[PDB]
Structure formats: structure tokens, C-alpha cells
Design a protein around this ligand. Structure first.
Ligand SMILES: *Cc1c(COP(=O)(O)O)cnc(C)c1O
Ligand SMILES: *Cc1c(COP(=O)(O)O)cnc(C)c1O
Ligand SMILES: *Cc1c(COP(=O)(O)O)cnc(C)c1O
Ligand SMILES: *Cc1c(COP(=O)(O)O)cnc(C)c1O
Ligand code: NA
Ligand code: NA
Ligand code: NA
Ligand code: NA
Lengths: 395, 395, 395, 395
């Protein structure tokens, strides 16, 4: 029972063991679609759910099962379900929970494709969504309705790294009879554990920190066994079909083995870079949970064991300065992902949101000089020198 | 332009080319999540859809792009979209096309998880489904409604390998203003091409023949560029998130290279085994498009270039005989998939449908002695001798 | 016991079985370096060779073990040993068998890197090699010495596809107390079985036909258990260290599943292309075992079940014509490998042997207009039309 | 030019870059055997070595090239060459450097299969080896002969973690005109850099720390470009054929990205466990470079930036106590590898060397109670509690 060891030991060992056939230490890649039964009796046993085995990889698989058990342990949930993408973990969750007529209260500062799913796809199926500022828990309460099945939040949230009081939101949702689903992608279980704070369901894009090596698109869902069985035998099997390939599970198991030491280096590196940016006369704002000037600093200190690897910051001179600076880094790479071992940088005003009206973007927290930085495992002095060089150039 | 060569040449070369960086012949495994831009300008160009490149693997990927282009060529469609599973190809299609209030006419003899999706998940989102016997095209017409967006069919269909007149159904659907979606999984593009017969959209589980090696769960969607862009930038990106991992795409590209020679051997082997079963006094019925006694034999001859690798057959003595025979093979393997290089066998009455009421199953075409056989690439005499041994045992 | 079924059944099933832990049909990828023991006793048991298990992937591995067992079955040898390359299979063999003072008789028409190993590396370790024309078995006998441990041959041989009478050479070697090692790469076990003809050891580059998909560098060694144990526990473990990665073994297991149907299509396609080339007035010579004009045609008919997928041919007008024609194909690809699913072509006089003196190359069988063709699985009319177009251009 | 950044930055970025075709951040897996040329001219250009490209994966490959460039940077060598195993890196080196008549001076405390290669395989090819105690540099000098081409050392050495003064041995070898080859496997470039100390060639089993994830068998060779070209175009191409598969290279690139943070945690964890063992009344000896009682402690402080992740120690009560304790761990795993993320333990007296005469083993430094520990990334308190439990049991 691995649930008893320290959290680093669990990251290494939870859900894994030497192969019972051969002693192979690495979990084998069960890259198979079909499983063979010894008897007609066994096929019937496994299919009606009266026997525990494997049948078919869309349903379950030994490599994926290890990833699922591990992350269940690390989030302190009963069960895990892996998915083809983080988006797929989110929609497999909500399409399992919601039907025509149901309602959802959702943070507005959430991942873009989640916003499009809730804004345009959900109401198309008869499921209505109210969007609120999840940093003010009263807004969550005001929007709740007799039909509300789910409150949905992300913390820290993009793009300004605002926070959401999970424990407080969980009590509000629970009192009105709703579930709290938390996207814990930015933090990983090493830094934040929503289920310990009262959330019901945790979703991750394992694409980001949990895998950590920028070579896997994936997601995971953690929660009660009864909900997870529904998300598997209805949500995955019937609705999204978003199963994770066993190779992607195996890469994620391998990437997650260094989660603890990676997050330590990410956050130590990020704290140094945030302090450097807070002292730079060309940087108007730095958004980072580890800085004292952060509006919800003490909530972050209660709710997160580390301030995280993501920084946002605003550069003197708006849209053209951010573009100059972003075209002037030589070590940070221009990309839209985060959580990789390489430092990644994006300038949303001249990249992702370039054909959006300026004051349409500004309502959504994205200013003309806002830059988001995914701090990698490089030497922080090298990242800082690069940033200093590009900032200095850009002004 | 590979669309000009013979169909075997296309299976080998369509969508593929030596790598422009290095001349590597095998398509590289671009096992990456993130892509890097050279400039802020490039990020903005690619994101608004004004420039053709790559951004993020959930959206698109060079390895997956090759698989998509290849199968587009082989089905004679404009564009392809790969998915995490065959189920995901089906639901990404229909959830892209349908919204609250829409209606679907569907064959009843369809894959089980498709039946559960249409029967229970679709009406939950406000989308109603009428199920009909797609072997009688008038039933399709009778069920059509002003709200019908889609007619959905599978041919050949499980479990009795009944057929559906694609060209006739396509005209009916088109006259009433609906699209025809065809699941072409059983046949592969080598044996049947729905889009040439007037279907609008073709879906496959590449898990079966297209990959052929029983080591990939995947699906593909082929059709017009305008629909495929919606299925990608809304259906995948926002709703299912069912993207295919680039490794699974690469295995499918590799498996499909032998599609033509595999299907030839499957069908040659299957024809021999069907004739053997038709002559066996303990076998009451053999269902196989290549046998003259097949109810729709001449339609199969117009619509399919080969009779296929799947056989169903009924064994003297019902439920207990089928169980004895299935527990008595020593070379065919008991499994629920099909299209692998190994011969696979299942007895649905005592496996998949064992806790279903007998006359509930019989309405659904599954009799007590029905066995489904996925004929592999073994020597047919060996498969036959094994079958003969087990049949002989079972009675 | 799979050694009892037909040869296609064996290609599918030999050495493989459903996983005993999970029923997974595909052999798992045991991508591990280390294996764990349950007890100190077990470690000691396995290490002294008193117990059968796994210890460490350089020594053995369950995925590699399957590949080894399969190819042992197909060559009718007792045991197999997989290697990092075909070269590594050859040198692990000979460095296991030979020591300072030993001697080798070798065909001169052998693979280039084998020629460099024998010509320059072997005598550097005190092991002398005499090179002979292995198409004249008397030359083999004349060169034999009291120190000769090994006769080494390749058949068919490059570049002119000359043949070597395996059964006759085997008797000569055995009478003088030497072993016959045969490189069976060109033929694969499907087309030729040296061990049935009296060879002692068979080596393959699985890079070519056995894998067949141009994505694996590998080799295999088949022979008696007593020699194979030495080649493993001394040759691999201590001398070359050329072990195969378990992923490469798994890809080779997957590629070899279609060996029988691939070789049939290769040889059927090759026969058609050879007949086309024999009729072309711009083609001076066609070398192909399936053509009646082949100098050793009837030996090929006794010794090979099919004439093979490789053709060589000479083009009117020597060096500049061969260069024009090779720069004028648009479907055959310019590459130096063979056995892939794509048709591959090379012009050794202006590629591999371009800075070699013309009459140095001509002693080695390579004329100015010689072209080697690896016939793929495309439609033969497409390959022929391409060849016809390029030949026509080149003259 | 990545050779200019900090050592962590180099671990992340050296030898790697976004793909020039597509911007893919992860280095693509160029899992190909064959490369295609655009022209006959290009084939001839690349083959004679007059042009820089790719030809064939046994020779070179873009994925393997990245791994080679990276590790060249980290060791401060000109060039790298990857191999199928650590053994293959060692023998490809020495079989490239040595021929019949040459001589080698070698540490006796070296890896077992290296000892078998030098003791039994080398003299079989006419290459003589003298074995010495490399901790006394005078022994190295005394054994040198006019024929000596190579001095070969390992530091730290198994099983007692004795050290070898690289800088001093390098001067001795160089004065007598020999090369110094150092096996740097135990340390990785993060902890020790032989080439900066005057070694000529560095070899690694990347199986251990450089990959770090217990799922790759591999080796690497770093040194001057002129020697590396010989080791590639003669040693690999002709003699061992021990090339690394591009998938194994890609896994090693991925594993090495966390080398710096893994080695920090290994050594921090190991220091704590060594201090715990030094204080335990049932532990007679602890061998660890970080302990002051270590015979060569100050040399270790000059030559290594960290004391390493390996500990050896002797347990009260000899052979039966070591066996009890090893059969009594429940978190450390019994295995013979090292450098994995899991803590690994072995008791050589009752496992690897169990059928060796007791005083044969004791000459070789292996006492009856000697245990070797590969300290993983678990929580050290958990490892210690496990060790304490098993020690306490064993006595
Ligand atoms: C990237 C991200 C996602 C989506 O994950 P994918 O694997 O890309 O589908 C969801 N939520 C958050 C907070 C993300 O950062
Ligand atoms: C197996 C199958 C499917 C489902 O494909 P998956 O990849 O398993 O999700 C869909 N349709 C048909 C006809 C099938 O046979
Ligand atoms: C290609 C070849 C080899 C070498 O195999 P590799 O896997 O490239 O090392 C050996 N013998 C023959 C006949 C070959 O064609
Ligand atoms: C394990 C080891 C080797 C051998 O490496 P392999 O990859 O197993 O062949 C060589 N040297 C040392 C010091 C080792 O620990
Ligand atoms: Na903190
Ligand atoms: Na037909
Ligand atoms: Na013949
Ligand atoms: Na130190």
C-alpha cells in the first residue's frame, strides 16, 4: 500500500510495481488493442463487471491503469481515469455529469478551449453556463440556480495568475447541492490538492507539468470511484471516446517520476525570475503568487505548497514593446504550452489574441504588454540575462 | 500528387514523402506537444488561420497529418481527421453536426457502443435518434423528419453481416436534405468506398483493419474540407478532445502500408473458411458476403471489391454448443476485436451478451449458437483444422 | 508448440502468445533495463544459470526473446539471438568463433561492411581471411587450411545476384571440419532456409525484409543452442555489446507478421519488373534469379522457394546513362537500403562507389551502368511506367 | 552555440533545437533505417565524406546526433558517439584503438563484464592486459610497456567506491605515450569531468544515470573528433556494429533533461543515508565519498563536484546477515542495475558472486556482508526507515 509513504516516495512508486510475469522494473508498454480470454466464462465474467481483468484498451489497460492509480494517490482521490487530452478530461467529466436542462457556474478566467466549450458547445446541447469572477466567491453563489450541477474553477488562473479559494468555493457549491470540479493543471498535485480542500473532482492536462517533457498530449480525472466508473463506462466508452494511448500513459508515468524535483526547480527558478522582474524599471507589473504584492498572497500561502512555475508580467510600452521583447529572446522559446523543461514565453496580445479587439482582450485580463512565462529548468541567471537582454532591447 | 497512381502505390506513398530536413524515409515520430514559432508575427499568423504551419498537437501534427492525408486519398475525400478511438471519430462527427433539437436516423445493426451513444447519450443532449432496419431503405425514408440532419449506417453490419445499399441510402438522405455518414470499419477503403457511392462522411475505427496489427486504438474521419475543419477546430478542439497521439498515428501509417496485401489474404482465407463452414453438417448457418446464399449477394458484388475478412456462423446445438466450441479452439484466440493478423473468435451469447435476456438478444440478431470469426493471416488449412476440431468436439 | 503449423501460421504465432499477466495480445514492450528479484536466492539462482528468468536487458528480455524464438522456428534452428545491427550479428558470430591464429574462407561478393570487417579488422586481431568466388565451390575447397574455422557466404550475392550452392558448400566445409555461416538477409526464411541445407549458423540483417518497414536497424543469429549461448553470454555480453533494444525487437515482431504476404508481393512484383526489363532494348543485362537466362537458374529453383525482390540491371550507355536514369525516377527512391515496402533504387557507379577507380569497381562486379532495384509493394505497372519513363529519358 | 551557458542550461538545450521543418520542440524520433537522396550526386557526395548529411542509421541519425552533441558538450569533448550498450561503448573504443600485439593497463576494480572482456576476450585477439590497483598510480606506471596503447580506469570504482586520481594517471599515461580512457558511468558529467582533468576518452553506460529511468540500455563515447570518426566509421560500422536505436537515443535525451536535478537529489539523499549507516551499530563499514572516513576523501573533493548516489556498506554478521537484510527490505528493490529513480539494492555475496569461492571474492573486494545501494529519488526518511527495519530484522 503506497498511500503510506512520503510524497516523493509516492511519486516514484505509487501505482507501480515490478511486472509479476518477469520482474521487469519499468512498467511494460502494453501497446495492444485486444485482450484474449482463457475461456468463454472469463469473457462473460469480465464484461458484465463481475470479474476484474482487462478486455479492450478503450475501456482499460495495465499501463494506463498504473498512471491512473498513481495520480489518484497523489491527489488523495479514490480513482483515476486517463484521457487523450486535458480538454478531453474536462469534457468527459462535464458531459458525464450534465444533461439537457442542467446548468454550470464557471470561472471566467479559464483556459481558452474550456471557455469555447462552455460558451458555445454546452448551450448547444441544452446545458447553460453562467460565467463569474471566481476570485469573489459571492459571485459564485449569486449565479447558482436550482439546475446547477457543477461549479468549475481553475487556480491559479490565466492570464494574471489570480487565485480561487477552493475550500470556500467547495462549501458554497456543496451547500447548494453542486459538485466542485477543479482544474489543477498549473499546480500539479505536488503543489496543490483540491480534493483535500473539499473539491469533488480534479482534472489535469498532463500535457503540462505532470508529464513535464513537452512530448505528450494527455489528461487525467481524479475523484470518487462511483463517479469515475461513470466517466469511464459512459463518458469515455460512449460519449468522447477520448482514451489515452498506452504509450502516452507510459511516457507520462516516466515523466511524472521527477515531478517533485522538477516542481522544486521550476518554483525556485520562478521565484528568482519574478524577483528580478519586480526590480526592473521597464516592467510595470509582475503577477506571481510568490511575490508579496500579489493581491491574494496569503490565500496562496494556505492553499499552495509552492508559488508555481508560471509568471506573467507587463512591459513598459504596450503592444510594440511586448512584440520587440518576444522577438528578442534567444534562450526562451516562443510557444503556447507550459510546464516543459525548457523555458517558454508567449505574448498573447500579438500572438494568440492578435485579431481580437484591444478592449475585448482587456476585459479578458490581457493587456497589450502582458507576457506569460513558463519557467524551465535552465540556470536562472541564464534565463534572467536573456530576459534582461530582450527587455533592454525592447525599450 | 499521389492521387494519380494505382491503389497499392497510394497505400504505400499517399500522404508520405522523405523528410525535407534529413531525407529520412520513414515519417518521423513528431512526439511533441508544443511547437516553437520564429517570431511573434508567425504565432499570430498561424493562430488566426492566415498561415499554414503547426501550433500544438491537439490541433495538428506532422505525423498525424500524413495519416490524415493518406486515408483521405484512399477514400477519395478532400480531408482527413484522426482521433483517439473509432468511437471518438463517430461522436466527434455527430456532436459537430448535431445540436439540441436535431434528429438522426440510424441503422439498428451497428456497433454496440455506437448504439449506446445514440440510444442514451444523444437524447440526453436533446438530439433524438430513430433506429431502423437499414437493409430496407424505405424504413430509412419513413423515419426521416424535418429535423433530421444525419442518416447513419454501417455496412457490412454486425452480427449477421447484413448489407446496406449506400448509393440508394445516399440519394434518400440527400433528397430530404440530410448527410450520409458511413462507418466503413469492416471493409477498409481497399474493399469499399462510401464516398464514391455518394456518402458525405466516412468514419473508421483504425483499430481494426487499417492498422491491422492489434496494437493501436484509433479512429479517422474523411470528408469535405469544410466539414473536416469544423470537426477539427470545434469538434476535437472543444467538444471531445479526442486527438490521436503521434505515436499511434505513426504505428497506423506503418500498419496501413500492408493494407492491400493483408485484405487480399484476409478475404482469400475467409472465402475458404466460409466454404468449409457451409459444407459442415454441424453448422446450421454461415453469414458471409462471398457465399451465394447471402441474402444481398449481388449488392455486395456491386458495392464491395472483396467479400471481407469477417464470418459469422451458427453451430448445431445453441448456447452450450457455441460455448464448448469456443472453449475448444487452440489456434483462434478468444477476443472481441477484429481486423488483427491473428484469427480471433467470439461467442456473443456466452460472452458479450451473456447477462442479456435470450429473446432480448434474438431481436438484436444474436442467436444462442452465433459465433463471429475475424479471419487472420494464418494458413487457412490450419484455421480450418482448428475449427473442425473444435466443432467436432462441441457436438 | 508452434513448430507444427504451416509456415504462415508460424510467421503469425511462433514465439508469441497472449501475455500471462493480462491477456494482452500484442507482446508487451518490456522497455526496461533492470529486472527485480523476489529473493536473494532468486538472484543467485538466475546468475549462475541454474534458473530460467530475466536479469538485465543486455543479457535477455521478454520482448527480444519472442523475436528470437520466432526466427529460430522459421529457420528451423534451435535458438535465436537478436543484435543491434546485421553487422553486429555477423561480427558477434565470428568474434565468438574465432581467435588469434584462426582462419576464414569467405565469398568475395558479400556486403561491403562485411568485406571491410574481414579484409581489415579481422587480420588486425590475428585472424586471417581468404576471399574466393563462392559460386565455384572448388575455390572454397582450395582455400581451406588446417586453421580454417569458418566458411562464410551470402546468397543471392550482391551486386549481380550470383548464387552459392549452400548444400554443396556445407558438405565441403563440414568435411574439413569447419562451420558454414550463411547470411540469409536477401531471402528471409520465407524464401530460403540454409540450416535445412546443412548450414550451421544463419545471420540476418533484420533491417531488410524480416522487419520490412524501413524503420529498424537490427540483426539476428540462428543456430544450435550451444553456439547461441556462447554468442550471447560471451559474444554479446563481453565482446560486441550489440544488444537489440526491446522497442526494436517489438517493431521487428510486428513487421515480420506480414513477412509471408510481403515476400509474395515483392517477388510477384519483381518477376514482372524483371521481365519488363529483359524486353527493353535500352537494358543490356538483367540479373534476376527468376529469369531463365540466369547463369545458375536451376540451382535457384532447388534452393529458393521464390526468386526474391531484388533486381540488378545494366543500362545502355554506362556511367552517364545510369546517372541520368537514376536522377529521372519520380516514384522509386534513391537510397542504399533494401527490403522496404517502398521501391528503392541505387546506381553504385555514381553513388556508393563513385570515387573508386573504374576497373577497381569492375573487378568487384560493379559496371558503370549497373543499377540495383529493391522492388516494393507498389503496383508493378506504376513501378514499370516510372522505370520506362526514366530509361527513355536517360537515352 | 550552447557551450556558453550554465551547466543546467546545457543539460536542457545542448545539441537540441526546434525542428527546422516544423518547429516541433521535442527532437523528432527519426525511427528510420534508410535515408533518401535527391540526386545521384548527393549520394556520392555524402558517401565519400565530402558532404554532411545522413545516409543510414547504423552510420548516423538526427536523433542520435542530438544525444551525441549534447553529451560532447557536457563532458567538454569535441564529439560524441552513441552505442547499443555501455559494454559496446567500451569495446568499440578499445577495439578501435588496439590491434594484435598492443597492450593495455587496466584498473582491476572495474565493471565485471569489462573485466571478462579484458581478461578473456582481449588476449584471444593478441591484445594483452595487465591489471593493477589504480588507486596507487605507481602500479599503473610499473605495468606500462612499450606496447601499451591505453590505460583504462573507472572512478569511483566498484564495489568499495575507491577512487582513481584522474589528473595524475593522465600525466603518467601521456608521458609513456598512452591514452587515458575513463569510464565515467558512476558520476555522470554533472559530477565529474575526466576530459577536463586530462583524460582522452570518456565512456558511459547511459543505462545508469545519464538516462536515469531504468528503461534504456545504451552507451556513449566522448573525445576528439579524429578518434570519434574512427570509432564510428571503423569501430561501429565494421567491428561491433553496436549502434543505438533512434528511439533509445530519444529516451536518453528525455531522461538526461533532468540529469542535474536528479543527481542533486540522488547525492543529497545518499549523503543522508550514508550518515545514517555510519551511525548504526550493526553496520561495520560504510563506503561513500561524502563521508570523512573515506580513504581518499580529499581527492574526491577535488575531482568530483558531488559524492554520488552509490553507497556500499557491510552488515554485522557476514553472508547470512546480508541475505536476511536483503530479503527484508520492502521499498528498496533487489536488482543489479544502478542510477534509476527507484532505490536499488544488491548483496553480491549471495547474488552475483554466490558460486564464487569466498576468498576468491574477498581478493576482489567483495566481503560476505557487503551490500551495494543505488539511492533513488524517494524520501530519504522512507529509505532509511526501510533500511533500519531490515537491518534490525537481519540481526
Ligand atoms: C493546456 C491546458 C488545458 C488543455 O490541455 P490539453 O492537453 O492541451 O488538451 C486545460 N486546462 C489548462 C489550465 C491548461 O493549461
Ligand atoms: C470496433 C468498432 C468501432 C469502435 O472503434 P474503437 O477504436 O474501438 O473505439 C466502431 N465501429 C465499428 C464497426 C467497430 O467494429
Ligand atoms: C544491409 C546488409 C547487412 C548489414 O545489416 P545492418 O543492419 O545494416 O548492419 C548485412 N548483410 C547483408 C546481405 C545486407 O544487405
Ligand atoms: C552497468 C555498467 C557498464 C555496462 O553498461 P551496459 O549498458 O549495461 O552495457 C559499464 N561500466 C560501468 C561502470 C557500469 O556500471
Ligand atoms: Na510558498
Ligand atoms: Na467479390
Ligand atoms: Na520460383
Ligand atoms: Na562534495
Amino acid at each position: 500500500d503506497c498511500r503510506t509513504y512520503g510524497f516523493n516516495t509516492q511519486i516514484v512508486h505509487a501505482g507501480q510495481q515490478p511486472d509479476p510475469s518477469t520482474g521487469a522494473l519499468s512498467t511494460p508498454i502494453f501497446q495492444t488493442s485486444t485482450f484474449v480470454f482463457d475461456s468463454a466464462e472469463q469473457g462473460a465474467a469480465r464484461f458484465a463487471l463481475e470479474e476484474s481483468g482487462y478486455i479492450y484498451t478503450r475501456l482499460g489497460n495495465p499501463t494506463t491503469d498504473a498512471l491512473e492509480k498513481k495520480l489518484a494517490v497523489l491527489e488523495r482521490g479514490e480513482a483515476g481515469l486517463a484521457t487523450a487530452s486535458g480538454i478531453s478530461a474536462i469534457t468527459t467529466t462535464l458531459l458525464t455529469l450534465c444533461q439537457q436542462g442542467d446548468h454550470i457556474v464557471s470561472a471566467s478566467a479559464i483556459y481558452g478551449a474550456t471557455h469555447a466549450f462552455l460558451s458555445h458547445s454546452m448551450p448547444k446541447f441544452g446545458i447553460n453556463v453562467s460565467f463569474v469572477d471566481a476570485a469573489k466567491p459571492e459571485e459564485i453563489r449569486a449565479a447558482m440556480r436550482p439546475e446547477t450541477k457543477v461549479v468549475y474553477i481553475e487556480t491559479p488562473a490565466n492570464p494574471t495568475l489570480s487565485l480561487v479559494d477552493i475550500e470556500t468555493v467547495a462549501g458554497i457549491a456543496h451547500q447548494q447541492g453542486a459538485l466542485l470540479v477543479v482544474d489543477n493543471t498549473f499546480m500539479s498535485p505536488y503543489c496543490q490538492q483540491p480534493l483535500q480542500l473539499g473539491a469533488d473532482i480534479v482534472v489535469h492536462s498532463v500535457t503540462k507539468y505532470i508529464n513535464g517533457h513537452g512530448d505528450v498530449i494527455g489528461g487525467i480525472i481524479v475523484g470518487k470511484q462511483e463517479f469515475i466508473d461513470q466517466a469511464r463506462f459512459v463518458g469515455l466508452k460512449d460519449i468522447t471516446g477520448g482514451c489515452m494511448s498506452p504509450f502516452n500513459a507510459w511516457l507520462t508515468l516516466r515523466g511524472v517520476k521527477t515531478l517533485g524535483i522538477r516542481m522544486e526547480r521550476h518554483c525556485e527558478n520562478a521565484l528568482k525570475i519574478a524577483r528580478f522582474l519586480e526590480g526592473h524599471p521597464s516592467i510595470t507589473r509582475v503577477y506571481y503568487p510568490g511575490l508579496s504584492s500579489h493581491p491574494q498572497y496569503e490565500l496562496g500561502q494556505r492553499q499552495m505548497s509552492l508559488p508555481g512555475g508560471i509568471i506573467s508580467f507587463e512591459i513598459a510600452g504596450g503592444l510594440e514593446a511586448g512584440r520587440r521583447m518576444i522577438n528578442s529572446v534567444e534562450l526562451c522559446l516562443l510557444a503556447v504550452s507550459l510546464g516543459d523543461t525548457e523555458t517558454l514565453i508567449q505574448h498573447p496580445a500579438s500572438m494568440t489574441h492578435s485579431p481580437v479587439a484591444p478592449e475585448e482582450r482587456l476585459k479578458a485580463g490581457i493587456t497589450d504588454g502582458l507576457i506569460r512565462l513558463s519557467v524551465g529548468l535552465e540556470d536562472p541567471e541564464d534565463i534572467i540575462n536573456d530576459l534582461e537582454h530582450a527587455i533592454r532591447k525592447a525599450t
